[PDB]
Point group: C2
Chain length 309, copies 2
């Protein structure tokens, strides 16, 4: 079934995609296209991939893009996590150590969330009779424990049904999405609701492929973070919550040591009063340590197309 | 910049996509996914592809799918032609020789076109004052020249502006698309208009990438064919027209020896009368030779998602 060897493949790819060039070429795009096409052709030879199979793959990719699910698929196949594995190894080779660990962004960030100093309430109260109240708090410091005032703590997470605002058009705009600037003591406090883990859209393209792979499409409960500050490396991270069925079986492979938090229960009447609440709530501490930006440091910032509102 | 070797990549891909499987798996889909992901990860290592670059690639693929242009991109990068190169080599190894050569289908077939016996007029006459009339005719035979009656000759082509019906919603439904069944003499005749070659949509995703590659997105003038008959191998082919600027510079690499036709000019008053026309016209002969279906023969039919109306 081998109709072409790699030499013959490379010659064909060059004839079609390089020899045909006239005028200015983007050299990087040319390099990447030539490599990926040659690899695709060689996989077609090695696995004897039939035209009907190739068309099914392209039809799948078309459907995935129309469903806006390619970011989700990048998470599920483990490509998004792989990019973090690479970034961690690049940082190790730079001698950059310390700092809260990174993990995946996911595909559901939205720019433009309400900003406040030191404290934000993240939810609109529309689920107050059906989900636990959660307070999250932490201090943002450098690697030696010195507080950072004015650090930008961006948080987003799912509602009691595992759905995110903007994508779920039934929620109010920016529900469960906030930017909190750390106060004079380096502190942030978020008053919110307990996120639940969630699956992929069950009739969607990502779950369709996971089904063929015998795989589930679930993530454990988590809260996403961007943390940034002048003079420090930007951090993309999350915490997961101890106790979740899928904690160490995340379909997007994002859970890490250092990023698992325990939700404590507060039933004490005095403490409840102090928080201006009326019922028991859950409490999570999540401190963040940022690494100073050095001339030698690889960038920790990632350009990516992101929703805005 | 090499953070992982292929052994480490393969182990990671297995951990994420295979070890996580529970219950029935589609073994072929699993095999192909594992191979393509491992290859993608290795290309990322070898070329030190940055997260921002990966996200740009996925955003491009998303945009391409939303624009319904991935079939067009398959043609332009030469993947569609490569599939034919493979099919030709498989046929050679089977000892299948003879027959009109195959070439690419393109992405613009529509099922459901008007059917008639022996003769069809393909155009609605809406361009009669701005484009040349073309008569196409041919005989469909086996490899020894014996006529085949009742062969299904499916033809589609572009209008005077290089646009195809169904996709160009300004044209009448099925304009320049017909199915003609060969008559008792194995003959088909199509009365139509001269197609013009065309480019990719200039603001679309395919041309955007071709621009980065320094490449044009043009095809020479051509008419597409499916030819099928009981007992014979289905044929996907075209003819191109001698004289076209892009005849041997097709951005989708479809031109072949054996598939170039010369448009003859008919100015003779007697012949014009015979055809029931009033002006000179162009004439193309395109005969088709079909190969008998043998038990040993690979399939020449391709399952593919196709428009219908
Ligand atoms: C670049 C080009 C390379 C790829 C292109 C070339 C590679 C060729 C790939 C060949 C794959 C083998 C095909 C085997 C035959 C298919 C059988 C089948 O059951 O049909 C369908 C399966 O088709 C597939 O999903 C296979 C394609 C997956 C390839 C992409 C893997 C990406 C890997 C690496 C890239 C990095 C990944 C990047 C990270 C994002 C089942 O139907 P469906 O549930 O999948 O979808 C269903 C469905 O079909 C329903 O009918 C519909 O109603 C519903 O909505 C839909 O969900
Ligand atoms: C499976 C996953 C693998 C890939 C995923 C992983 C691989 C990662 C790929 C990395 C590529 C290198 C990126 C370099 C930096 C980009 C710079 C730039 O100028 O930005 C843009 C270029 O971005 C690209 O097109 C690069 C991605 C191409 C990769 C796909 C090749 C497929 C090969 C093989 C697969 C078989 C092919 C299959 C056959 C079909 C220029 O803008 P634009 O004109 O391209 O689009 C423009 C634009 O950006 C405008 O802003 C917009 O308005 C307009 O509409 C749009 O058209
Ligand atoms: Fe999330
Ligand atoms: Fe065409």
């Amino acid at each position: 079934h081998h109709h072409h060897n790699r030499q013959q493949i490379d010659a064909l790819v060059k004839q079609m995609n390089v020899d045909t060039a006239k005028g200015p070429v983007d050299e990087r795009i040319q390099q990447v296209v030539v490599r990926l096409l040659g690899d695709l052709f060689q996989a077609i030879e090695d696995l004897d991939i039939q035209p009907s199979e190739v068309w099914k793959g392209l039809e799948y990719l078309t459907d995935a893009g129309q469903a806006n699910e390619l970011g989700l698929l990048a998470g599920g196949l483990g490509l998004e996590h792989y990019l973090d594995l690479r970034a961690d190894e690049a940082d190790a080779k730079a001698g950059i150590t310390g700092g809260t660990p990174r993990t995946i962004e996911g595909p559901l960030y939205v720019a433009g969330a309400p900003e406040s100093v030191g404290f934000a309430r993240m939810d609109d109260g529309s689920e107050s009779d059906k989900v636990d109240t959660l307070i999250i708090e932490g201090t943002v410091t450098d690697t030696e424990g010195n507080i950072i005032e004015g650090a930008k703590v961006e948080v987003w997470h799912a509602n009691s049904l595992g759905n995110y605002s903007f994508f779920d058009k039934s929620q109010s705009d920016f529900n469960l999405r906030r930017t909190i600037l750390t106060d004079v003591n380096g502190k942030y406090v978020a008053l919110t609701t307990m996120p639940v883990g969630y699956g992929c859209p069950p009739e969607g393209t990502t779950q369709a492929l996971l089904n063929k792979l015998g795989r589930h499409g679930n993530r454990p409960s988590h809260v996403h973070y961007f943390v940034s500050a002048p003079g420090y490396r930007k951090l993309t991270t999350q915490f997961n919550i101890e106790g979740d069925e899928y904690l160490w079986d995340d379909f997007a492979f994002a859970t890490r040591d250092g990023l698992v938090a325990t939700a404590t229960d507060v039933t004490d009447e005095a403490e409840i009063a102090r928080r201006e609440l009326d019922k028991p709530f859950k409490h999570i501490t999540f401190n963040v340590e940022l690494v100073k930006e050095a001339e030698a440091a690889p960038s920790s910032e990632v350009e990516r197309r992101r929703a805005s509102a």
